[PDB]
Amino acid sequence: MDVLYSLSKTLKDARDKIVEGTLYSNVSDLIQQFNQMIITMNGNEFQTGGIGNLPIRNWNFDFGLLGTTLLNLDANYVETARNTIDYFVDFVDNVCMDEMVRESQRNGIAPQSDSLRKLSGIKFKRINFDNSS
Amino acid sequence: HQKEVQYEILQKTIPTFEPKESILKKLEDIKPEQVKKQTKLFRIFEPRQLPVYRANGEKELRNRWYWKLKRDTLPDGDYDVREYFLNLYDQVLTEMPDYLLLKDMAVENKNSRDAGKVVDSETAAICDAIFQDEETEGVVRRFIAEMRQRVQADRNVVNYPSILHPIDHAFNEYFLQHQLVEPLNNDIIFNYIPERIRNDVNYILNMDRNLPSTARYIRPNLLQDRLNLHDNFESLWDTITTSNYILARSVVPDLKELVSTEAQIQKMSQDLQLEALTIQSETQFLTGINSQAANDCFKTLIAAMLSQRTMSLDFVTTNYMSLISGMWLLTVVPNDMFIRESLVACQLAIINTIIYPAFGMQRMHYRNGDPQTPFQIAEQQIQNFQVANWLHFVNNNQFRQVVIDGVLNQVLNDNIRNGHVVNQLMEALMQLSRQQFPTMPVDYKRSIQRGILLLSNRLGQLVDLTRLLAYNYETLMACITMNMQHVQTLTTEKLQLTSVTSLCMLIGNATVIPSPQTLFHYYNVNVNFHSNYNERINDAVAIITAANRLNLYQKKMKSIVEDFLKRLQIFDISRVPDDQMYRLRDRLRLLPVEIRRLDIFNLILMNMEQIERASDKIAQGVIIAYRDMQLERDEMYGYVNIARNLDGFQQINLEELMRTGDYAQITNMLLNNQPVALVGALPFITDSSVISLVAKLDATVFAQIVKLRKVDTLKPILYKINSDSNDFYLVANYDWVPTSTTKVYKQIPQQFDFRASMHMLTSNLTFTVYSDLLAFVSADTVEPINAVAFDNMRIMNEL
């Protein structure tokens, strides 16, 4: 749940802060967090949605890191970031929906969907950052 | 010959200095980060008196103070200017002080009426010049005569008046506000000692020095590897582990009071009865058994484990004494410390020469690439509990990973540390001495069993040796500061099993532990290497990031990476593979810049344009407007064809024009007299001749652009018409408006303002910076006879 929230928060920050012409100093920490997220998620397969009419979605992560060398962000940087952000946002939305439609009488506080169960492993705990909501 | 050729092919890709041992010197020459002290305030600007002119172009009777670059050496061309500012960034970083004590730079203020002092002598010169100037305000003069320093010795604080350009003040204030010195007290030194050595009862640590409150020190940057050189840098990691292995060899203690080599050799010869056998190699059996080999084995084992450098096993299969000793070696040394082929070969020799023949089992037909080692198969296939249990331990005695004080450490099984598992080995091989060896010839069987008993009957000595080896490893591992990453290296350290036999058969009961000074030296070398590694990473990342943010697209990061590797002191850069160099570049590009260097770069970046426009030898551009424009009236020139901005003109970037080589647009505009602004750092000719302006020579300087398709020779004319011109009468005695078709895009110098330049610089009155903290620790050791292990029992109990 903390890793899922951190993914969503990182993506929201990327959508709100990775904008054309912005100083790299405005995004440097965010770019580090985003690259950490990409590294952590790369090479992992996820499956979301086999309950009700929720479609089966398969997710593969093979993305390049964002650059750290610009002074102000330009169109190329924003386009690469936007493509990666779109894929990740779709993945996070599907994972959230898959988790929202499931319930358990025994351990209902624990994750129900297999995607969130996978995200609860130690290998994803690096993604975790600011939990302010 | 062929083997040497192939090994040379492999070694040419490893940046390890070929005389391995020489590396030690290179490792021990790395000193702590040199402490830099500022001797004078950092200045880019100085006040200078310049002549001024009335609106009619007549020189006035007074000069005016303006800020000018002390060293006006800016090059032409925008790219060259950005390179100049990168070089300025490097100069500032190298000359950046680690601390400042302003009292050192404080000098006497000549005009002070209250014994005033200022920092620095340049401020004194400026203040004297302003005091003597007739156009100075009386209030400013009285303040110079009354401004005072404040020295609070009880608080250890000093404030001094200074005159500085705002950029110079920014730099000096950053230096003053962000010094690297921290207060030093005995608690900090005590915590600087490794925590496991402070808890070891074999070492007595005392603090017999008093540190004044004015003591300072600079914290080493013991950040863990940001480049992850253990991952996907085979050659660099091979070099790193080789250097660590050499250092560890240097610090491993020497064994004392070893068994007499003559007595042990005669004993082994009598027991083995080799002469009575039919072994084709009768002499070679006991060769290599001596005290030198035993010491070399001790050093090699502990150093290899400390450096996590892979070891290869070199043995003659027919020498079953070597195999019997290798049984102990595999018992005590984790099996992941050996190259897989060597471990498999040694284990298969042990299985097919000793263990399976002992139990009458069919010789193992082991297959290379099997996920199981020969011992892992034997553990399942052997039913005897002694041998099977020893095999189980040997199979599962890999290093355990644990983080202590933020450092990853490879630690041993507790049964190795207390030496208890040797008993199991003894048990196992005692069983091997009772086995029938069904089909073996009886003399060879007797020789093997008597060798097994030779190792067996040294149970107490081997327990003592195992405890001593483990204790020495742990004590020297307390002194490691970089993560002990376990990787199978390209090259290995070759360990002779005859040296293992020497160590097993010659070790006595003389405990030898690292000296406290040896531990402190090892820890200091490790800290120095780690800090230098981190600092050079910071420097490389800073320069790469600055070059990228300065848009220095022709800069080769390869040179930066090579300089970084050279400053690491342990790489022969000529043998670094290119793929690894480029991977290093990529990983360095991803790291964030250290705060101090990044702040300095921000300062330089934000003040770049102001510094550039202060230069008197480059202009910021030239507008070619084929209409007649009146010469502006400027206090610094008289009449001058100066453009304050480029508004209203198409801009052609001269750097882009140079880089592309496409001169079609510029040529079309120059041919058709299309107004334009050529933008870029340009040298200009200062022309004071009115006749030159009438001759319109400023408009004659752009045809060479079309002719040569070059912009590096473009030198526009800047007119400076005033009463000092030889032909100024033409302006004065005739009715006309001096005009030109070209203007030079340049700025006017900033006037000196006393209120905007007078600052108070604050620092500490005095302190002493110390480098060797462990010099403040009085370290003694117990008698080796009384040295105990982690379990509070003596390391060697056979006494």
DSSP 3-state helix, strand, coil percentages of chain B (rounded to 5)? 45, 15, 35
For residues A80 and A58, what is the distance between their CA atoms, to the nearest angstrom? 22
CA atoms B453, B459, B461, B463: torsion sign: positive
The alpha carbon of residue A107 is apart from the nearest alpha carbon of chain B, in Å, by 33
Give the separation between CA B386 and CA B207, rounded to whole angstroms. Answer: 51
Contact A11, A66 (CB under 8 A): no
**Within B96-135, where are the H helices?**
102-105, 121-132
* Contact yes or no for B507/B461 (Cβ under 8 A): yes
User: CA-CA distances (angstroms) from residue B421 to B15, B92, B156, B393?
Assistant: 40, 59, 61, 8
Do B464 and B509 meet the contact criterion of CB atoms below 8 Å apart? yes
CB-CB neighbours of B442 under 10 Å: 8
Method underlying the structure = cryo-EM
Q: Could you tell me which of B737, B746, B694, B691 has the C-alpha nearest to residue B718?
A: B746
Nearest CA in chain A to B542: A69
CB contact under 8 A, B548 and A35: no
Measured over the CA atoms of residue B46, residue B47, residue B50 and residue B54, the dihedral's sign is: positive
Measure CB to CB from residue B590 to each of A24, A35, A70 and give the nearest one.
A35
CA distance B515 to B475: 10
The count of residues in chain A is 133
Do residues B365 and B409 make contact, with C-beta atoms less than 8 angstroms apart?
no
Chain A positions in Cβ-Cβ contact with residue B549 (cut-off 8 Å):
24, 69-71
Among candidate residues B421, B400, B523, the one with its CA nearest the CA of residue B469: B421
Q: How far is CA B20 from CA B52, B524, B569, in A?
A: 69, 21, 13
Q: Tokens 């604050």 label which residue?
A: B762
Across the interface, do A65 and B545 touch by the CB < 8 Å criterion? Answer: no
Report CB contact under 8 Å: A71, B549. Answer: yes
The residues near B682 (Cβ < 8 Å, ≥ 6 apart) are: B76, B618, B619, B620, B621, B622, B654, B714, B715, B716
Residues forming a β-bridge with B218 = B181
Cis peptide before B120 (omega within 30 of 0): yes
C-alpha span between B705 and B707 (Å, rounded) = 6
Burial of B34 (0-12, 13-18, 19+ CB in 10 A): exposed
Looking at CA atoms only, how far is residue A28 from chain B in angstroms? 8
Contact (Cβ atoms closer than 8 angstroms) between residue A29 and residue A129 = no
E strand or H helix that includes residue B51: strand B45-53
Are B306 and B244 within 8 A, CB to CB?
yes
- Exposure string of A57-74, with b = 16+ CB inside 10 Å and e = fewer, is bebebebebbbbebeebe
The separation between the first and the last C-alpha atoms of chain A, rounded to the nearest angstrom, is 12
The single residue listed with the structure tokens 């040896």 is B518
Query: How far apart, in whole angstroms, are the C-alpha atoms of residue A31 and residue B259?
Result: 63
- For residue B570, give the nearest of B28, B8, B12 by alpha carbon: B28
Q: How far is CA B520 from the centre of its chain?
A: 21
The rounded distance, in Å, linking the Cα atoms of B573 and B562 is 7
Query: Mutate which of A31, A34, A69, A73 to test chain B, going by most B C-beta atoms within 10 A?
Result: A69
Query: Which tokens in the block code for residue B166?
Result: 């705002």
Cβ contact B41:B168 at 8 Å: yes
Closest alpha carbon within chain A to B601: A71
Whole-angstrom distance, CA of residue B261 vs CA of residue B507: 10
Q: Which of B86, B228, B231, B548 to mutate to test the interface with A (most CBs of A within 10 A)?
A: B548
Determine contact, residues A110/A104, Cβ cutoff 8 Å. yes
Q: How far apart are the first and last CA of chain B?
A: 50
- Per DSSP, the residues of B468-509 read HHHHHHHHHHTT--S-------SS-EEEEHHHHHHHHHH--S
Pairing of strands B493-496, B717-719: unpaired
Binary contact (B549, A28; C-beta < 8 A)? no
Number of H helices, E strands in chain B: 32, 25
Task: Provide the CA B505 distance to its chain's centre, in angstroms.
Answer: 44
- Determine how β-strand B685-687 pairs with β-strand B717-719: parallel
| Cα–Cα dist B400/B102, whole Å | 53
- Give the rounded distance of the alpha carbon of B685 from its chain centre: 47
Which structure tokens are listed for B175?
Answer: 């230096």
Nearest CB to B589: which of A24, A32, A69? A69
Helical H segments across B134-212, by residue range: 138-146, 166-177, 186-192, 195-198
| Beta carbons of A70 and B549 less than 8 Å apart | yes
Experimental structure resolution, Å: 2.7
Contact list, B548 vs chain A (CB under 8 Å): 69-71
Question: What letter would DSSP give residue B526?
Answer: H
Phi, psi of B237 (to 5 degrees): -70, -35
Judge: A69–B590 Cβ closer than 8 Å, yes or no.
no
C-alpha B366/C-alpha B371 separation (Å) is: 11
Alpha-carbon distance B660 to B281, whole Å? 76
Distance in angstroms (rounded) separating the CA atoms of residues A91 and B196: 47
Q: How many residues does chain B have?
A: 799
Concatenated DSSP letters for B737-776? --EEEEEEE--PPPBP-HHHHEEEEEE-S--EEES-GGGG
Both tokens of residue B547?
A: 């070059």
Q: What is the 3-state secondary structure (H, E, C) of B612-673?
A: HHCCCCCEEEEEEEEEEEECEEECCCEEECEECCCCCCCEEEHHHHHHHCCCHHHHHHHHCC
Pairwise CA distance, residues B44 & B67, whole Å: 10
B590–A71 CB contact, under 8 Å = no
User: CA B353, B358, B359, B364: dihedral to nearest 10 degrees?
Assistant: 0
Residue B125, min C-alpha distance to chain A (Å): 40
- Name which of A24, A68, A70 is nearest B590 (Cβ-Cβ): A68
Give the list of residues 6+ apart from residue B538 with CB closer than 8 angstroms, or none.
Answer: B221, B593, B594, B597
The distance of A111 to chain B (nearest Cα, Å) reads 30
Chain B residues lying within 8 Å of A65, measured CB to CB: 590
In this complex, how many residue pairs, one in chain A and one in chain B, have their CB atoms less than 8 Å apart?
Answer: 21
Q: From residue B508, how far is each of A56, B254, B797 by CA, in Å?
A: 70, 13, 11
In the stretch 65-124 of chain A, residues with CB closer than 8 A to chain B read: 65, 67-71
Residue B187, SS3 per DSSP? helix
Tokens of B147: 């401004």
Task: Determine the residue of chain A that is closest to B598 in CA distance.
Answer: A25
- Residue found under tokens 């299969």: B317
Residue B688 phi, psi (nearest 5): -95, 5
